[PDB]
Amino acid sequence: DGKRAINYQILKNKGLTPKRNKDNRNSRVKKRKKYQKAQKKLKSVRA
Amino acid sequence: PRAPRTYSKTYSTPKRPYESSRLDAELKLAGEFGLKNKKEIYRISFQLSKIRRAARDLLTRDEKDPKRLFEGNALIRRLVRVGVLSEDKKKLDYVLALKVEDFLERRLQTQVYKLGLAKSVHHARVLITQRHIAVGKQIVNIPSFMVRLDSEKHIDFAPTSPFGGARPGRVARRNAARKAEASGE
Amino acid sequence: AKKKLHTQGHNAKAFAVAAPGKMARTMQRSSDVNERKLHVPMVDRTPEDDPPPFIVAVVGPPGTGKTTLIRSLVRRMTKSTLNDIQGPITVVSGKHRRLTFLECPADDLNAMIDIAKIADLVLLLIDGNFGFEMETMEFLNIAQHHGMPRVLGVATHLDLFKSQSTLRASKKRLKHRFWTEVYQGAKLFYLSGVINGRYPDREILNLSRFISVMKFRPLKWRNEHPYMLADRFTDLTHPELIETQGLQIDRKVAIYGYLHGTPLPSAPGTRVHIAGVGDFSVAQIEKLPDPCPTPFYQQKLDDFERDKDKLIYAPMSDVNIGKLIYMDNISPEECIRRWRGVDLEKFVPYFDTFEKLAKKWKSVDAIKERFLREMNAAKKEKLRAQFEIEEGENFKYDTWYELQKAKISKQLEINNIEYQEMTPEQRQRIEGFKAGSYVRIVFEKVPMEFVKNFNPKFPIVMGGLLPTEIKFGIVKARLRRHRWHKKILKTNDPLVLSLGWRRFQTLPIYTTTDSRTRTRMLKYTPEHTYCNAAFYGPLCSPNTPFCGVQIVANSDTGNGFRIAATGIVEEIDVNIEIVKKLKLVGFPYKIFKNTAFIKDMFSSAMEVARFEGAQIKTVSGIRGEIKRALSKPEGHYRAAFEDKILMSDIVILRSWYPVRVKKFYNPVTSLLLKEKTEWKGLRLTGQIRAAMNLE
RNA sequence: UAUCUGGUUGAUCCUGCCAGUUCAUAUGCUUGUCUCAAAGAUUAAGCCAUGCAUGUCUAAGUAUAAGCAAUUUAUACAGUGA
RNA sequence: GGCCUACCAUGGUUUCAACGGGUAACGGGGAAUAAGGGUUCGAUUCCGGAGAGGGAGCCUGAGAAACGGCUACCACAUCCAAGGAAGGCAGCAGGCGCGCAAAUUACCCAAUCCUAAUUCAGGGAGGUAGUGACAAUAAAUAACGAUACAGGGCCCAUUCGGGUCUUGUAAUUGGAAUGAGUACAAUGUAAAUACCUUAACGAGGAACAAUUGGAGGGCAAGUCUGGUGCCAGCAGCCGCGGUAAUUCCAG
Q1: What angle do CA C120, C125, C129 make, to 5 degrees?
Q2: How many A/B residue pairs have CB atoms within 8 Å?
Q3: Region labeled Disordered — which residues (chain A)?
Q4: Domain count, chain B
Q5: Boundaries of domain holding B63
Q6: Within a domain: residue B123?
Q7: Is there a contact between C125 and C99 (Cβ–Cβ < 8 Å)?
Q8: Is the dihedral of CA C482, C483, C487, C489 positive or negative?
């Protein structure tokens, strides 16, 4: 069609964001991937 | 001109913003009970905080004062009701004790994990917010539902959803729509 | 606290506030509201008596339809349905107000850039179903750099949407998106349908009322340059001149319009620029009665003497010492002899002889006017008079902005009581055709292309050029890649840019400053910040913002963003020394400890001698100097470094080679061209390679 | 201006000073879903275009509408009703 | 009832603060703040009072010193044929008050109730939706396996090691799940809209594209400043070429 379209850049209008994780997106995962990461440390501090 | 809709907030935030011990202490809880917020801990601290205040007060009144007897009893039975206060320690000097973990242990989130149907604290989150697991025939999608002793037996998958009969589900059926449309007619 | 308070004459303690809290909390909030009211002080220079029509210019995507939108606004203000609207049209909407609509072309950036310099108020319609197209976004960006007009957006195609819930969400999105482009708190009106060929009266009535109280602010460019919009176009040539010379002539042209902004001086011979044709000059200036007169204005004319049917004007569409001084036949000898009845090169004016002056100036009693119970009173009075003379300037508001604003307001009515005394003959020449005087100014040397290829649908304005602006020097501007535009700009790559009243492509050059010791050219543009730049072209005032584009031909746009470079100008000269860095590389072919023999950097042993003592450095970062031209081979030289150079190492001598600015200049001449879209100028470096198939 | 850490010494202390440490207005950025939903402020109780915000009839005060209606016992009236 | 008048008398209040002045003063229920004692605030959902541009006067009436009543003056201010006539948003909405600012000129009497001659009419009272993160509530942006080496475990260790119980960092992988949204229908509603339901649709990073602040380094044939070589310092959107050009400390 002849009618010109919005670019995804100028729609959301997010310019110059530094690269981020996928895991800030769902907080219940970053809680999971922290505790599962901070349970490996617990096996290393004590037995 | 209409009666105020009343409200109030349900959490309180730490005075000391950056205390490293409290921060590690908080995170471990989050990673244990599948929380997403420091607020989900802030919230409970606040709940506890008033419960403890009530109890402190009641304790100052004479033994067997009517209010104390009446309002203390009430608070104890409310706590035993949901499995926060053990049967033995049923007399409010231990509600004066009572930890945050005792409260977090009773969330529908954690209760689903204890049964093992979810198989994880986080699998327990995702299931709940996704319309599986119920109490009666009544679906519950709130992780903080707080499982009252006599419904613990009734945590189970819902009649709807997969996992509880009903039907597989659009993402699976969509595949069975590529099974019979590729290999057949 | 006991005696500090009592130091002042009034009891300090007695005066206090009943509430500390309310006094203090209210005091901060009131102050914030004020500070907000304060804005930097400006000048209006538009007349209180005869204001021009505030030009309102509908813009937007073409398939929405702005012709039927302007026909549903003029039929509710004058109750007279129009048809096939083309060109600028003036309608009286009120007892003192009378706006002038102007349908832009949507297809032409050559006119879209042109209109935003003059549109006082711009009505922007964005399709509700299609949101914002590129043409809306492109127009908003160009308008902001030149000077922001008052924008009142509207949203056609609102009726189409199937579900009201989805429609409400879409309205919020456009309203929120509009706030970022313009100013937050500004809401675009929505029109439900065009079933009868016009919008609903209730929606239109609100839109007409909202526009009426616009009270547009004064743009900086518009109060420095006399401008006008051409109402009707007229060629005044003999057809016998046409039949003899055979369509080759440049035609004598009379043009008609309303002046604006600042007084266009009435001595014929000021140079003045048609947007999109070229630099012309005025030849004859004449003022005729305006077709549309406000009813309040008409009443005054009727009273002095002692038009209801036509409420709109759309011509393009179908229905003494001083007068003894300023003569040149009189000699200045005769001028004073006519007034009573010498070279300026000597500084002391002509006196009389000291014989005649000493006898005259025996007594000083002629000049004693200029120096500095009843009796007692008189004396006192005299003293008072002298005290005022002795200390008057020293002896003679709450907010500084309000005061310094009185430097403008007192400056306004001291024009007005001055102009009033003149007013019938002297004021007109002094007035010089003041803003809104519907003037008939005629031209000459307008090309044949302009009268042949003309349609009234595109506008034509005049820019009264300042004598600053009339020349051609290389300007020092600074600019960046407009961050919507994808590719970065290249040095020495032509760029159409709208600087002042002119639209033109020139060959810029993008010149950083190596920590303010010189002007080094880059090769590209720093892709997120302003770089200092330079380009040939016309000259302007400093602190003038421009907004330069890429390919403006509508045949070649694509879906990319058109506006590529925005910025202001810093200063202007006629020569900027501009430096490209070159470095001379060399390689060592015999090293020692702390002394190298470096080959093939210099060709002859004489070439080295022009360069000895030069602070050579290497890749590795060690310094040195080059000292003597080695003889027995013709090229090489001995150079002492600070430490042992390797064999694997590459010496580089920094140096500076000056460059030039290519003096190409090309006004766009858009509506001299026949097709009036798709004006194609100089191609980009990448485009020429594809055409010539180079790599 | 209380409470806490931190500082002058090669060190240990105390008095001693300096350094950090809400909920009310504005502004900035951001704003997917449910429910809930308020909405003042230049010491200007300043000024107001336009539209609306006060009208009202039962079996039961007044009907010759040259009003509508017709039938239904109605030649005083009797329905309905401006 | 000194409320007012006539006669007559000389009384009345005051350091236990009269009288006067100030108030960015309507009073109260109350608010915020948490050892206690206090301190500060209340124009503002309820009660009371007062006012309707400013003053005064008054008609009607049970009730007004009424202003969506009248009369006069003052100040504003509109209409005109110049003779005259007319207006009072501190109701609802809406506009101005500066030259740079932000709630809709929408729907209904279905509820709540009020008024009338009255079940019926009227009600911008009030309710409905629309409109900037005032405050408050609930709480997505992902969940699980397999594999490829790497581990720490642990039994053995004369010495290869990996092999099961999983700690998890992985640049190929694997199928499951779900609403954000889009949408038959029914429900909702005065009618709509949303919600609660729910057919059909709707997730792999190149989306259906999480933010807003903060700590820290690195890079150039770059620039600048100082220096007892090659260093020290500031710093670096800028280099040499190049912007349909570069894939580039993956960004």
Answers
A1: 165
A2: 35
A3: 14-44
A4: 1
A5: 17-185
A6: yes
A7: no
A8: positive
DSSP-derived secondary structure letter, C251: B
Contact A2/C63, CB-based, under 8 Å? yes
Q: Residue B183: inside a domain, yes or no?
A: yes
Residue type, B164: G
Way it was determined: cryo-EM
Does B5 reside within a domain?
A: no
CB contact under 8 A, B122 and A31: yes
Nucleotides of E under 7 A from a protein CB: 20-25, 34, 40-42, 45-46, 79, 95-105, 125-127, 130-132, 135-145, 151-153, 167-169, 175-179, 181-184, 192-195, 198, 200-202, 205, 207, 209-212, 214, 221-225, 227, 229-231, 237-245, 251
Quickly list DSSP for C139-151: HHHHHHHH-PPEE
Give the resolution value in Å. 4.9
Counting beta carbons within 10 angstroms of the beta carbon of residue C254, is it exposed (0 to 12), middle (13 to 18) or buried (19 or more)? middle
Q: Is residue B170 in some structural domain?
A: yes
């902001």: which residue's tokens?
C144
C66 annotated binding-site participant: yes
The two tokens of residue C463 are 């820019």
Count of C-beta atoms within a 10 Å radius of residue B85: 22
Identify the residue among A25, A31, A36 best suited for mutation to test binding to B, counting B beta carbons within 10 A and taking the highest: A31
Neighbours of B52 (CB within 10 A): 14
- The residues facing C548 across adjacent strands are C497, C565
DSSP-derived pairing of the beta strands C666-667 and C596-599:
unpaired
Rg (CA), chain B: 22
Burial-class residue C259 by CB neighbours within 10 Å (0-12, 13-18, 19+): buried
- Which chain A residues are within 8 Å of C559, Cβ to Cβ? 4-5
